[PDB]
Amino acid sequence: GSSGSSGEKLHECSECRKTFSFHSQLVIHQRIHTGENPSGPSSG
Ligand SMILES: [Zn+2]
């Protein structure tokens, strides 16, 4: 596959794999994922 044209390897998420204009934003996005901690011994 002949790559048309490339430049600066943009950044993207690791959970949703979404690209962002600037990494700065990306890092902020990854947050949405990291939320409350439900996983636990709590059976009820
Ligand atoms: Zn994400």
UniProtKB/Swiss-Prot annotation:
Recorded superkingdom: Eukaryota
Start and end residues, zinc fingers (C2H2-type): 11-33
Subcellular location: Cytoplasm
Tissue-by-tissue expression: Overexpressed in ovarian cancer tissues compared to normal ovarian tissues. Isoform 1 and isoform 2 are expressed in squamous epithelium tissues. Isoform 2 is overexpressed in squamous cervical cancer (at protein level). Expressed in blood cells. Isoform 1 is expressed in pancreas, lung, skeletal muscle, heart, placenta, liver, kidney and brain. Isoform 2 expressed in chronic lymphocytic leukemia (CLL) and several tumor cell lines. Isoform 3 is expressed in several tumor cells. Isoform 5 is expressed in fetal liver and several tumor cells.
Induction data: Down-regulated during erythroid differentiation by GATA1. Down-regulated by HTLV-1 Tax through the CREB/ATF pathway. Up-regulated by the regulator of nonsense transcript UPF1. Up-regulated by the cyclic AMP-dependent transcription factor ATF4.
Signal peptide extent: none
Primary role: Involved in the regulation of antiviral interferon signaling. During viral infection, recruits SETD4 to TBK1, leading to TBK1 monomethylation, which is critical for the assembly of TBK1 complex and IRF3 signaling.
Subunit composition and interactions: Interacts (via the KRAB domain) with TRIM28 (via the RBCC domain); the interaction increases ZNF268 nuclear localization activity. Isoform 2 interacts with CHUK and IKBKB; the interaction is further increased in a TNF-alpha-dependent manner. Forms a ternary complex with TBK1 and SETD4; the interaction between SETD4 and TBK1 is ZNF268-dependent and leads to TBK1 monomethylation.
Domain statement: The KRAB domain functions to reinforce the nuclear localization of isoform 1 in addition to its transcription repression activity.
Family under the similarity heading: Belongs to the krueppel C2H2-type zinc-finger protein family.
Protein name: Zinc finger protein 268
Organism expressing this protein natively: Homo sapiens (Human)
Shown part of the complete sequence: 329 to 359 of 947
